[PDB]
Ligand binder design. Sequence first.
Ligand SMILES: N#Cc1cccc(Nc2ccccc2C(=O)O)c1
Length: 133
Amino acid sequence: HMCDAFVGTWKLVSSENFDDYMKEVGVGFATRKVAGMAKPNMIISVNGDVITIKSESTFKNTEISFILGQEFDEVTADDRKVKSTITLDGGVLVHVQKWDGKSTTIKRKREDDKLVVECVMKGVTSTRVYERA
Ligand SMILES: N#Cc1cccc(Nc2ccccc2C(=O)O)c1
């Protein structure tokens, strides 16, 4: 019953500062424009200790499966090859990506009937609000 409140199919309903967050990450112009137009669905499921998170949109469909606390390799939607570790910290899923001596942290939290995603790169934060689909 690890992660029960996250499981489901979620749809993006608002975004703030996502272009700036992508700039800080190093995403190029054309990817930023196309990616920023997307209204992804995030589909979260759990089977034993394995969590799966799918992101589907007109831009890209990606999928990660992982065990909490156990590093894995991830190819991001913008084609970074990163080393990822996802943990639960006080009810928040905390996803750290490392690549080329850089780091970004993506937090996912349940707040009321929403799933709130905070993406942080250095001083720049983007907030992405999802609702149940
Ligand atoms: N291209 C591209 C790109 C680059 C960085 C992050 C993301 N998207 C996300 C990642 C993680 C969680 C939620 C989102 C989300 O879209 O809400 C897309």
